[PDB]
Design a protein around this ligand. Structure first.
Ligand SMILES: NNC(=O)c1ccc(-c2ccc(Cl)cc2)o1
Ligand SMILES: [Cl-]
Ligand SMILES: [Cl-]
Ligand SMILES: [Cl-]
Ligand SMILES: [Cl-]
Ligand SMILES: [Cl-]
Ligand SMILES: [Mg+2]
Length: 348
């Protein structure tokens, strides 16, 4: 067991191993507080996140266990990994606090979209890396659920990592009105007309790719209905083949009210873009999710010819998510979390 030291930073007690020095607050949501630190064991600048109220309810205790399981599993160059996890508790009986340690990220994709002149080569390399990471995530039967520019870390060498997996955290208030939190969601998820599946992440990749090519949000809706109208004007209203599949009475009802529109010509929307970029966007931005390109299929598209290496696009170890359908008490979720903290082995 390492030695721990205590300090107060912005009205919060931080108790951390001596290896972590020069702690400085960086931000805080309702999920926890975050400090930047220097890790003397590894030489890395790190983010230390102290969870807030990790075991306050059954829903909160399960969410804590879900986040720790997911971060312990992810071992890939284009996905955030777990450097360390610790608790100052010496036993299950005094266990209350959980701290998570990752590499400190600087710029997100939001920063480089607003500010930099992107070549076609930049767009190829950035979207290649998102798809390489997503092939890995989807091979474990994990859905990200919240891909958007602020959840993509990028360095000076244009190297990218996926972060901030959806933990089923977002509220109705957070999705309301003119908000980036909704602009990258697939239309069938927008109003819960279908259950989440991994094809929803490819829709988000299409919205990010369009925004790197134009410098502008693809579907900046002022509310759910305005955003659906922007989507259907580009990709067309449902055809007979898709209508047949639509199980939700709610959806077919509102959709039959709208005048029919054809799919637009994407070469006239994305003026001057590489024709191979236009072709790949037509394969991602398909209303019928069964017909979208997969991450594994997209990596072999001629747009990525310069970067594609089928011997260096790895898949994940199997991931057991059976806990998701399990009914447990707060203290049982807390005991499972404690076992995962004490069994952690750091990376090489
Ligand atoms: N396999 N797909 C489906 O079961 C499904 C159910 C609902 C939809 C859907 C897609 C776009 C709009 Cl606008 C409305 C509904 O797709
Ligand atoms: Cl230490
Ligand atoms: Cl990492
Ligand atoms: Cl504790
Ligand atoms: Cl964003
Ligand atoms: Cl597993
Ligand atoms: Mg985020």
């Amino acid at each position: 067991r390492p030695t721990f030291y205590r300090q107060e930073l912005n009205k919060t007690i931080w108790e951390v191993p001596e290896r972590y020095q020069n702690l400085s607050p960086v931000g805080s949501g309702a999920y926890g507080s975050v400090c930047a630190a220097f890790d003397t064991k590894t030489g890395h600048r790190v983010a230390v996140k102290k969870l807030s109220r990790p075991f306050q309810s059954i829903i909160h205790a399960k969410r804590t266990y879900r986040e720790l399981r997911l971060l312990k599993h992810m071992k890939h160059e284009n996905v955030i990994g777990l450097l360390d996890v610790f608790t100052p508790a010496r036993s299950l009986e005094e266990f209350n606090d959980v701290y998570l340690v990752t590499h400190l990220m600087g710029a997100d994709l939001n920063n480089i979209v607003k500010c930099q002149k992107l070549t076609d080569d930049h767009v190829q390399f950035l979207i290649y890396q998102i798809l390489r990471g997503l092939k890995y995530i989807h091979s474990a039967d994990i859905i990200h659920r919240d891909l958007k520019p602020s959840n993509l870390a990028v360095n000076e060498d244009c190297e990218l990592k996926i972060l901030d997996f959806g933990l089923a955290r977002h509220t109705d208030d957070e999705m309301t009105g003119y908000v980036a939190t909704r602009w990258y969601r697939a239309p069938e998820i927008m109003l819960n007309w279908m259950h989440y599946n991994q094809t929803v992440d490819i829709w988000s990749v299409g919205c990010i790719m369009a925004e790197l090519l134009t410098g502008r949000t693809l579907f900046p809706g002022t509310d759910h209905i305005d955003q659906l109208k922007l989507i259907l004007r580009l990709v067309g209203t449902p055809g007979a083949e898709l209508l047949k599949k639509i199980s939700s009475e709610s959806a077919r009802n509102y959709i039959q009210s709208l005048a029919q529109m054809p799919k637009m010509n994407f070469a006239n929307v994305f003026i001057g873009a590489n024709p191979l970029a236009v072709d790949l966007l037509e394969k991602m931005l398909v209303l019928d999710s069964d017909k979208r390109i997969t991450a594994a299929q997209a990596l072999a598209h001629a747009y990525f010819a310069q970067y594609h290496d089928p011997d260096d696009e790895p898949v994940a170890d199997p991931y057991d998510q059976s806990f998701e359908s399990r009914d447990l008490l707060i203290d049982e979720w807390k005991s499972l979390t404690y076992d995962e903290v004490i069994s952690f082995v750091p990376p090489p």
